[model samples]
Target: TNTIFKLEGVSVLSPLRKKLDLVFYLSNVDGSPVITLLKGNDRELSIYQLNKNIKMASFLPVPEKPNLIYLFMTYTSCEDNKFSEPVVMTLNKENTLNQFKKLGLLDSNVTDFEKCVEYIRKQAILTGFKISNPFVKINSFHLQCHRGTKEGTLYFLPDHIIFGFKKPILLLDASDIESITYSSITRLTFNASLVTKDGEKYEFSMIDQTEYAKIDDYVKRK
Candidate 1:
């Protein structure tokens, strides 16, 4: 059975109200195309089909025009023979699909989560973004050997350097364990094709197209 219903998860970029994404389910039954179009909403809505099983169902874009705006679709059906059995639909573009696969590091044929993490970390570390080194210092300590209460009688140590956002951020190999930012952040990746900001977001990376350090190489000479 095929049913037509509005799609779900309509995430339109705010302000512009441009459709960014939409997932519609499509089912074909008795040679009829069934689709429930979803518009003007921000949550998921399930539309039951007229039949028990469907041949195809998914979200699709109307494809109006160009302007830095677009949408996508995803469909699924049990009657599809395209890939062994059930048919699944998606509104992914060629470039976007490739990036998605790369981001997931799935098609790479390597399944190590560590490599996946490396891909992500390297992607996040914008060129020239430095990691500050941690510095440690010594402090006075007390001795347990003395049973009686007394002044401190231990050695003191100086603080070690710490990673900073300022210039000369430390470049760490995978194992420079002296110190590191408690939280890890990757560089903003553009080739990934997934944007971090909203509504035609603009980033310095888009303009400079170079690592931050490289962007200001002259400053280093000073």
Candidate 2:
């Protein structure tokens, strides 16, 4: 599917507390109508409908834990059928936390999980929005090792760099990382090795070389 239009960010506004709502802008490409769909993990919800042309639309009463949401669209065309691949346009918890702090909806010092979620929910209600699960699960990417593969996501926050499989494998502060290096093992993959301050070594593989470079940059900078 060709991408006809895209947005940098989207705000979900559940105004009445009875449904999930979101307001966003769309681009009118090619004179055909468009429809948008919201997919949060396994749950799919319709946000917009097919029409001759669509520029904007909203949906009420979304799903619980709308953390990793993808937006896709389809449109009618005379020459060929068209659709859009799922795009990661929805902002995650970190973005919401930053917004809340900037707008005085939440305290800058707030980091406790329960308190953070409580503040976010309260702020959503006060701002005429409703949220089911405001917290973004720390899962973002997976890591593996030759000994045994661990599958989970990575989270890089202000205080920690965490990787979780079934549980946390690499939960470290900047000070804890002694060295970060990536060794090329194959054309398609490389090995990322981390040395901790306490003399522990952790090795992971199957990451792209460019991705390893990016991670190396981040680890050193952090």
Candidate 3:
């Protein structure tokens, strides 16, 4: 049975579940999954894919050491039939965030919105990509002046606004923006628009008018 383990203030998910029908190995002593995929009969299995995700990774509490925990992961090579020794990461929350931030996978200003930092952290882990700094989550009405429009949660930072319904996130920079316009209250339609410094225009049609003021104030101040 696959048991789901919960950790306070920590969230974990794996993209491999969808791609490889794999799940986290919760009871493995080494913390890594013991791979037993059928050999020749499993004709479709790729050596590269197996080596990428199958391995022992574990989390353990350090009793003798104060305020310390042990985290380890073992790397495996399916083609070479090699398994490397465990590598460990024991940095505390503050230190861990700092390390990710230095690596450009986390925002440096996440102290205020620590909860959202976990969201960004999960994104980086699952996608295996670096996130930008000062990440702030916001509700946004996406407007594509050149294409179709949609709505989704947006990630805001010092100079960038990132949002997309799919992979390869889109970015809009405040520096590139010229002005933001919105439909007046007197007008029947409620909308907001952004014009980049380069004359490219984006408009959000049929949205809450109040969002216009909120976005306006936030971008201006930034």
Best by lDDT: 2
Ranking by lDDT: 2, 3, 1
Expressed as tens digits, the lDDT of each residue in 65-174 for candidate 3 is 43444333334454345323233334245554555566565567766334434554354344333333331264332222211355533433455554432323245776
As a TM-score, model 3 comes out at 0.36
Off by over 4 Å in 2: 1-118, 121-147
Q: Which pairs of residues have clashing backbones in candidate 2? A: 19-61, 20-60, 20-61, 20-62, 33-52, 141-153, 141-154
- Model 3 lDDT, full chain set: 0.41
Candidate 3: residue pairs that collide: 31-57, 32-55, 32-56, 32-57
Reference-based lDDT, each prediction: 0.25, 0.42, 0.41
lDDT of 3 at 32: 29
RMSD of each: 24.3, 17.3, 14.9
Per-residue alpha-carbon lDDT of model 2 for 96-125, expressed as tens digits? Answer: 566556656568987543454565345334
Candidate 1 lands at a TM-score of: 0.17
Write the number of the candidate with greater lDDT, choosing between 2 and 3.
2
Clashes of each: 51, 7, 4
